[PDB]
């Protein structure tokens, strides 16, 4: 069980093994010039930047700290009308990304609006007695 | 979701053999086994047997595990995602019985409990 | 009914285009391999089942980028070393003696300044017949009307040793395993690995050396292969050992353009004087070059295919443009392209100007004489000309960037985008 | 195997061309390289020339401006020539048989070898002298003994110029024979002795004048 | 006239150098020139020697560049002395056309001779030509440094004296010759003639009278 | 041994059933069933699978109903109709033959 090794298994299988992406994405797969150490100091602050914008979206969303995570955004037929042992049971993560590619940016405005209401709801309800 | 292709009319006589072509295309050959369906007008539809291109893994009828051997080529790639490959197909003690259509199926899902059920079919392939 | 759900860390990357870094092994050298950072005592090689991924070895950017961080390496350690700008004064060459008559190097006298403005010296120096030109005797450097010249630190070891070229974090790079991979396209048993192997930097011309060997049968990449325009790389299957000496003990002196420029000329022959050569082993060459002959007539309808010294290239073009332990050599290769060895003739050079720059002149400074190579042959780069019914097949070079794409051909770069989105029934609360 | 023989004159004038030939006894000259060598009185040895066996020539940078080396293959014979000569040119004139030999410290392809010529087989080499003085024969006198042993002589008065071969008995008598060297006069000529320690018969042969003389020994 | 010239004891081993030394990979030839003879092939390549030539006489063979071509000779005989040249023929130096320095090789440590005295009256048929000539003749004396002094009866001569120079023969050992010319009339006159011969720190004398 | 609803009539619009039952072995509660439009002589297409799990591009107008003894299938809103029972690692246990 190593790094990406599902990444041509169905999602289903991918799903149980997604804590070794997880795992290994801040450390890798495991005060000089400009040669090396201003190009490698610039490349460990990308690590962190392709990092923090991935962990702040989980963040505007209900997902801050989970690696799996559910909402209340009902799924759109408009996205795909494919089966659930069609996607989980016969289809990869980067196959099923490229359907959903055109519609990757909807859902993530709809997640982070979604939540929001969730919060002024929560702050409704505990303003009682 | 691709595209199963057989060989035309391959018609000898009893006692003898002959071996069906199935090539594949369209879709990744090594996801999905490939069953082998027949239907003689005396019987009725008679299923015989699956093979996965990706791990050789054999699983035959019971009637058919004495004269009944298929083989699988493996993958020549195209895509990421789709690919070329071929599975044939040869049995003996032919009879003037065994006389019927047979047909390269294509599996349904790639996990779960029907992943070998025949999906995609061909255009099918007479015998004597 | 369905819902959205995020699922973070799934195995997904998108393109490449990003910041590579270094990575050495333990341990001065020129490659400022002593800022990168320890490569990782065990690599992380795992296989990616059932993934197939499109490489492009012509358009990958790791190429781009070493061939761009070699280049900016060079800059970067020639500034505080010797510039012989002084050095461009009349040289009154004449000759080194010999006993047959049947040069190479030439005894140049010359003035150069010893206290600045004070008293001068009338030293002397023995420069190569390639590193002089006449301008009728009155001689003088090679690329003094050029651009400025300059001379490599003796401190220093421009010996290639592995480096390897690691991905940050978040991103990763992806390794084709699949034997016969012919540069380009689809490919399987597919792995993925952080840093890349042991990649030595070795320029040459004509000839790859101490590459890493193809396996089972020989292997071919190029391009537009029908176009002739386009340059081929051949991979090796067995390899071809290429012993190369200069048989001449050089002298080195130490001349002094004060205060603290010193310039290091070749001294004196002592000894015998022979000529540069490279040993081939003609057995194994006349029947290596039969093995690419017959992967070439693979990819041609059984055209029988010739082959042919260069055409108008430069010295570092038409011959094996190599560096050995020190000294540059170009070896002239029209005997291999036409039971016991081959030997070709190979001249030296001091003063070069390496990835053919304007405003660059190195000084190799004189090795104590008596060098010997041991390398070894494990590619080609031939090129066409035009377009009758047979084939030529010339070597070639001129572009560097064709040497790193010989060894980062199998790798591209992938970054990481761990977040999933699929549907499944499963709520959240009010 | 090889024998030689240096035949020449003996003294010539200066100014003149200096014949000399070297004959050959068991090996042949087309096979061979010749070379010629002098040996000045008061200087060393000065290498002067050598011929192949293609007849080919290459002569001492300092005199080749004067010698010319030929030869003659109907018999075994090979001579030189020697121009405008002056009263330094007189030495001794040796024939040798030179070989051939390749001293090879790289490979043969970039050259990377050198000839050098070596002389195994040597003459005994002709005294040649140059002076404007004419030859003269020597005057032969016999020096009679008188009464343990006993010890008898020739003597050999004004001739020029060196050599003067002496026999006892026309090469009969061996043991015994001491010639003595001669001595330059002020005159200008030499005077040598002979002495040994049956009757005796002095051989007197003087080949720059032909001169030959026989004279007996008796109190 | 440049001579170096170089000692050596008897019996030990000589060890001559070369002069001019080797630029690069040469091959030397060694010359044994005696005086007024014909010069002897020691060596004519670094090592090798023709068949006759003991093997006394041995060079260096140039392995290694770095050596120096010596001619070393051990057991060193009395007829080992005479002149000694060095061809040198390498591979940075052309056409080599002239021999090496002679070195004047002198063997140390031989055993004296006493001379041998002879002195012969004027000819039987020289008088008869109006011209008499003493002659002296000097042999097998080792070294060769003899003073003649003529004498006519009890008074010195030197007038009219042709004196030769020492001169080696075959057995190793010297011998010269010394001439007085005189006149029939001079020759006569005198009671007696000598030949005084001061050899070392000893003289011996021969004695004629006309008679 | 698998015994289907033998020959069935049909009008236009209504709903019609077949069946798939057959012994204990090869049938019911224990096993997978589904359905197949096979005109004999073409390449026939799957229908349902998996009791009442619908194919990719089957359009809402078809169902499946399982008991613990038979298993079948309606049409709403041609040619033959065959069924299979099969478990996760076997094959395919056929029926008969149906016509609707
Ligand atoms: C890449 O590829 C390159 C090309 O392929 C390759 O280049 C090679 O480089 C090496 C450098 O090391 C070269 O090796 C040199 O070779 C020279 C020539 O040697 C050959 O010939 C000789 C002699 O043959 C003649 O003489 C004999 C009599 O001895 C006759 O019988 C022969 O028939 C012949 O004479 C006739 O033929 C001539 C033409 O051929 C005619 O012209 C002539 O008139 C006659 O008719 C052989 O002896 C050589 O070796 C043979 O024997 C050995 C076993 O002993 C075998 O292994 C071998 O295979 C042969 O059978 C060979 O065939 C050598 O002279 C030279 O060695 C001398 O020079 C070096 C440097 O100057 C010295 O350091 C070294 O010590 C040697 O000096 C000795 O010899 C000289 C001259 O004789 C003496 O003056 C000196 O004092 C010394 O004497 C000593 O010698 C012996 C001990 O060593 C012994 O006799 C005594 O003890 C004495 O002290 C050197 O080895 C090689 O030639 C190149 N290749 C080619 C094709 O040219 C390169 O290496 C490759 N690799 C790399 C990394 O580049
Ligand atoms: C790469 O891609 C390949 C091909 O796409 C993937 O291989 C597929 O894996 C899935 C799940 O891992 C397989 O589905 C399972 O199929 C088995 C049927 O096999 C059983 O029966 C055979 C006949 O008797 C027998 O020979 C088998 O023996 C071995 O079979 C495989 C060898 O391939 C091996 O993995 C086994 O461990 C056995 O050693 C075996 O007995 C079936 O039993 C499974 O059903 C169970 O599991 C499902 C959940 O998956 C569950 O819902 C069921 O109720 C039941 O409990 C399951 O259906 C599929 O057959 C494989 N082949 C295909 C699709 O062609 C591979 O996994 C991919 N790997 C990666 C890393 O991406
Ligand atoms: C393609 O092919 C090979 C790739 O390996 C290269 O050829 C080798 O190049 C290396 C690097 O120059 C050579 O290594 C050198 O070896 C010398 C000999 O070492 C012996 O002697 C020392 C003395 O102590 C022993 O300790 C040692 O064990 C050996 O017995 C060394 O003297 C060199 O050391 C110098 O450099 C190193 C590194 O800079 C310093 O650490 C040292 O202090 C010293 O300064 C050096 O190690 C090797 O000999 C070559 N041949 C082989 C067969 O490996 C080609 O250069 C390469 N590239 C081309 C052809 O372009
Ligand atoms: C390249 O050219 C330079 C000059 O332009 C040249 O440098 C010269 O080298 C020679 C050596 O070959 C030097 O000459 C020597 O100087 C020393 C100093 O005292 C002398 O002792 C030497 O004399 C000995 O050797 C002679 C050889 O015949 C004997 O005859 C003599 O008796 C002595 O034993 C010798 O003369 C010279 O001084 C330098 N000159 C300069 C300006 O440096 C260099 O050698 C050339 N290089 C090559 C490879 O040709
Ligand atoms: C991957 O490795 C397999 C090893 O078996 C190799 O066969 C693939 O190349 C294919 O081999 C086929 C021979 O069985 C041949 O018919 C086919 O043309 C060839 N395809 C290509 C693209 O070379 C290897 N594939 C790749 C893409 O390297
Ligand atoms: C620098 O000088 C070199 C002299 O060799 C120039 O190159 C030569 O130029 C002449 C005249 O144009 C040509 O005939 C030769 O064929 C050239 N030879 C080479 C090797 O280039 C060179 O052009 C000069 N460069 C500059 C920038 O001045
Ligand atoms: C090459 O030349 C150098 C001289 O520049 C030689 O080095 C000499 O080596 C000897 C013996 O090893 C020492 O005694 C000398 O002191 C060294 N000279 C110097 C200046 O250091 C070297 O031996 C030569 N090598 C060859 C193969 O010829
Ligand atoms: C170049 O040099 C290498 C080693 O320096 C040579 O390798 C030899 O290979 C043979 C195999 O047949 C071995 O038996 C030898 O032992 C190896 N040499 C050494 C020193 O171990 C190679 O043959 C050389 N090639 C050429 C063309 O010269
Ligand atoms: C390498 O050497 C070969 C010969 O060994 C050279 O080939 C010759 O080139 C000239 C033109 O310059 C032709 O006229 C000859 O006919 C060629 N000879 C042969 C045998 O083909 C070649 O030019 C050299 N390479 C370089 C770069 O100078
Ligand atoms: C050139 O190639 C040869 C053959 O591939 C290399 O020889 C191997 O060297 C390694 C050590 O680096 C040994 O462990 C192997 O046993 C050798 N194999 C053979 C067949 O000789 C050689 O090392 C290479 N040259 C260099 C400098 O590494
Ligand atoms: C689905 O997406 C479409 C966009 O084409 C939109 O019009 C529709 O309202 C969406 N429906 C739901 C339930 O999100
Ligand atoms: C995305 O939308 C574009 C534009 O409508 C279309 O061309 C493309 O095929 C779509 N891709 C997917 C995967 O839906
Ligand atoms: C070059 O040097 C030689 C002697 O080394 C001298 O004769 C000549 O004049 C010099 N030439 C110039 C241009 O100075
Ligand atoms: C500079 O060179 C000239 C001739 O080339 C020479 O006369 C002069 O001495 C040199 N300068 C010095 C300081 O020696
Ligand atoms: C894939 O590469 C790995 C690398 O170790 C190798 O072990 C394996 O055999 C390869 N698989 C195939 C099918 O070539
Ligand atoms: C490499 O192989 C692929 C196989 O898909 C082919 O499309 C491509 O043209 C080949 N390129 C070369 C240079 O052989
Ligand atoms: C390769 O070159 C030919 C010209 O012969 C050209 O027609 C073709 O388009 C080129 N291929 C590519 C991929 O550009
Ligand atoms: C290299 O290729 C040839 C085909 O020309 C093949 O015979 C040989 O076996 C290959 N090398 C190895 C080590 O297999
Ligand atoms: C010089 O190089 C040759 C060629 O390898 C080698 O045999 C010899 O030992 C080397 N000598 C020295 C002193 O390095």
């Known amino acids: 069980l190593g790094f990406l090794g599902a990444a041509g298994s169905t999602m289903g299988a991918a799903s149980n093994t997604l804590t070794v992406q997880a795992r290994q994405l801040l450390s890798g797969i495991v005060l000089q010039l400009t040669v090396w150490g201003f190009k490698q100091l610039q490349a460990r602050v990308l690590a962190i930047e392709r990092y923090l914008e991935v962990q702040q979206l989980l963040g505007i969303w209900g997902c801050s700290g989970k690696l799996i995570c559910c909402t209340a955004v009902p799924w759109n037929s408009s996205w795909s009308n494919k089966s659930q042992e069609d996607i989980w049971d016969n289809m990869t993560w980067m196959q099923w990304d490229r359907e959903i590619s055109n519609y990757t940016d909807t859902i993530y405005r709809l997640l982070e609006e979604s939540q929001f209401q969730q919060e002024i709801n929560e702050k409704d309800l505990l303003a009682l007695d | 979701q691709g595209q199963l292709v057989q060989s035309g009319a391959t018609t000898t006589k009893p006692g003898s053999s002959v071996k069906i072509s199935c090539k594949t295309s369209?879709?990744?050959?090594?996801?999905?086994?490939i069953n082998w369906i027949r239907q003689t007008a005396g019987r009725g539809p008679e299923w015989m047997g699956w093979?996965?291109?990706?791990?050789?893994?054999?699983?035959?009828?019971?009637?058919?595990?004495?004269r009944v051997i298929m083989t699988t080529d493996t993958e020549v790639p195209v895509t990421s995602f789709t690919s070329t490959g071929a599975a044939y197909m040869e049995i003996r003690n032919l009879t003037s019985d065994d006389t019927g259509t047979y047909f390269c199926?294509?599996?349904?899902?790639?996990?779960?409990?029907?992943?070998?059920?025949?999906?995609?079919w061909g255009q099918g392939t007479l015998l004597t | 009914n369905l819902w959205v759900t995020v699922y973070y860390g799934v195995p997904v990357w998108k393109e490449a285009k990003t910041t590579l870094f270094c990575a050495s092994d333990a341990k001065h050298n020129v490659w400022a391999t002593h800022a990168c950072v320890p490569t990782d005592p065990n690599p992380q090689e795992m296989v990616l089942e059932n993934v197939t991924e499109n490489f492009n070895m012509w358009k990958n950017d790791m190429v781009d980028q070493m061939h761009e961080d070699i280049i900016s390496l060079w800059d970067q350690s020639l500034k505080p070393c010797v510039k012989l700008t002084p050095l461009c004064v009349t040289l009154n060459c004449t000759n080194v003696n010999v006993t047959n008559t049947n040069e190479e190097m030439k005894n140049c006298s010359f003035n150069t300044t010893t206290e600045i403005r004070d008293k001068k010296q009338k030293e002397y120096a023995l420069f190569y017949r390639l590193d002089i030109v006449p301008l009728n005797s009155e001689y003088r450097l090679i690329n003094c009307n050029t651009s400025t010249i300059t001379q490599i630190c003796p401190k220093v070891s421009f010996d290639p040793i592995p480096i390897h070229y690691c991905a940050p974090a978040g991103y990763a790079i992806l390794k084709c395993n699949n034997k016969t991979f012919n540069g380009t396209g689809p490919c399987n048993n597919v792995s993925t690995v952080q840093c890349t192997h042991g990649i030595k930097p070795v320029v040459s011309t004509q000839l790859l050396l101490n590459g890493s060997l193809a396996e089972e049968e020989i292997i071919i990449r190029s391009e537009n292969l029908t176009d002739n325009a386009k340059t081929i790389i051949v991979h090796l299957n067995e390899s071809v050992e290429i012993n190369c000496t200069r048989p001449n003990n050089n002298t080195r002196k130490s001349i002094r353009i004060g205060p603290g420029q010193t310039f290091y000329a070749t001294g004196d022959i002592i000894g015998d004087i022979r000529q540069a050569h490279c040993n081939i082993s003609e057995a194994k060459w006349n029947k290596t070059l039969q093995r690419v002959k017959k992967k070439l007539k693979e990819h041609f309808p059984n055209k029988t295919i010739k082959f042919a010294p260069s055409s108008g290239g430069d010295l570092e073009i038409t011959t094996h443009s190599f560096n050995c332990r020190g000294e540059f050599f170009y070896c002239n290769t029209s005997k291999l392209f036409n039971n016991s060895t081959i030997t070709l003739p190979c001249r030296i050079k001091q003063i070069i100007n390496m990835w053919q720059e304007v405003g660059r002149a190195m000084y190799a400074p004189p090795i104590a004489g008596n060098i010997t190579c041991k390398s070894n042959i494990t590619g080609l780069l031939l090129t066409r000309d035009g377009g009758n019914n047979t084939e030529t097949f010339r070597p070639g070079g001129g572009d560097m960037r064709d040497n790193w794409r010989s060894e980062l051909y199998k790798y591209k770069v992938v970054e990481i985008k761990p977040l999933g989105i699929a549907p499944t029934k499963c709520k959240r609360r009010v | 195997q090889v024998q030689l023989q240096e035949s020449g004159p003996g003294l010539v004038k200066p100014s003149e061309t200096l014949s000399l030939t070297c004959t050959v006894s068991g090996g042949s000259i087309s096979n061979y390289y010749w070379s010629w060598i002098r040996q000045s009185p008061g200087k060393g040895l000065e290498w002067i020339g050598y011929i192949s066996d293609s007849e080919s020539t290459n002569y001492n940078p300092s005199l080749k401006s004067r010698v010319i080396i030929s030869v003659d293959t109907s018999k075994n014979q090979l001579s030189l020539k020697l121009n405008s000569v002056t009263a330094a040119d007189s030495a001794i004139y040796y024939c040798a048989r030179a070989q051939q030999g390749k001293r090879i410290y790289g490979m043969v392809s970039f050259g990377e070898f050198f000839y050098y010529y070596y002389m195994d087989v040597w003459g005994k080499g002709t005294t040649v002298t140059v002076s404007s003085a004419s030859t003269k024969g020597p005057s032969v006198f016999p020096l009679a003994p008188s009464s343990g042993t006993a010890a008898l002589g020739c003597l050999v008065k004004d001739y020029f110029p060196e050599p003067v071969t002496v026999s006892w008995n026309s090469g009969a008598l061996t043991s015994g024979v001491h010639t003595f060297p001669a001595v330059l006069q002020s005159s200008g000529l030499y005077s040598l002795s002979s002495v040994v320690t049956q009757t005796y018969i002095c051989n007197v042969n003087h080949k720059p004048s032909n001169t030959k003389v026989d004279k007996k020994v008796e109190p | 006239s440049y001579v170096r010239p170089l000692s050596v004891a008897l019996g030990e081993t000589a060890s001559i150098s070369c002069g001019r030394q080797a630029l690069g990979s040469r091959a030397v030839q060694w010359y044994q020139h005696r005086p007024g003879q014909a010069p002897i092939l020691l060596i004519y390549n670094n090592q090798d020697r023709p068949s006759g030539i003991p093997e006394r006489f041995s060079g260096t063979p140039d392995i290694n560049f770095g050596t120096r071509a010596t001619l070393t000779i051990s057991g060193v005989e009395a007829g080992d002395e005479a002149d000694y040249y060095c061809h040198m023929w390498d591979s940075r130096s052309g056409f080599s056309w002239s021999f090496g320095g002679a070195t004047r090789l002198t063997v140390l440590g031989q055993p004296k001779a006493a001379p041998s005295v002879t002195l012969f009256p004027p000819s039987s048929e020289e008088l008869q030509a109006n011209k008499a000539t003493l002659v002296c003749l000097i042999s097998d004396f080792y070294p060769g440094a003899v003073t003649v002094a003529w004498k006519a009866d009890s008074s010195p001569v030197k007038a009219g004296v042709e004196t030769t120079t020492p001169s080696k023969q075959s057995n190793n050992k010297y011998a010269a010759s010394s001439y007085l010319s005189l006149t029939p009339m001079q020759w006569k006159m005198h009671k007696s003639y000598s030949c005084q011969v001061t050899h070392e720190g000893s003289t011996v004398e021969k004695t004629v009278a006309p008679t | 041994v698998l015994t289907q609803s033998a020959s069935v009539s049909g009008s236009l619009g209504q709903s019609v059933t077949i069946s798939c039952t057959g012994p204990n072995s090869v049938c019911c509660s224990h096993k997978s069933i589904s359905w197949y439009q096979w005109p004999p002589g073409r390449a026939p297409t799957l229908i349902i699978y998996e009791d009442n799990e619908r194919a990719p591009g089957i359009s809402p107008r078809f169902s499946g109903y399982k008991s613990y003894w038979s298993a079948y299938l309606t049409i709403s809103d041609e040619t033959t109709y065959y069924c299979c029972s099969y478990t996760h690692n076997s094959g395919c246990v056929f029926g008969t033959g149906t016509k609707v």
């Open positions: 199926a294509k599996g349904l899902l790639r996990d779960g409990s029907s992943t070998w059920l025949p999906y995609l």
């Open positions: 369209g879709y990744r050959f090594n996801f999905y086994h």
């Open positions: 093979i996965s291109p990706y791990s050789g893994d054999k699983n035959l009828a019971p009637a058919f595990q004495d």
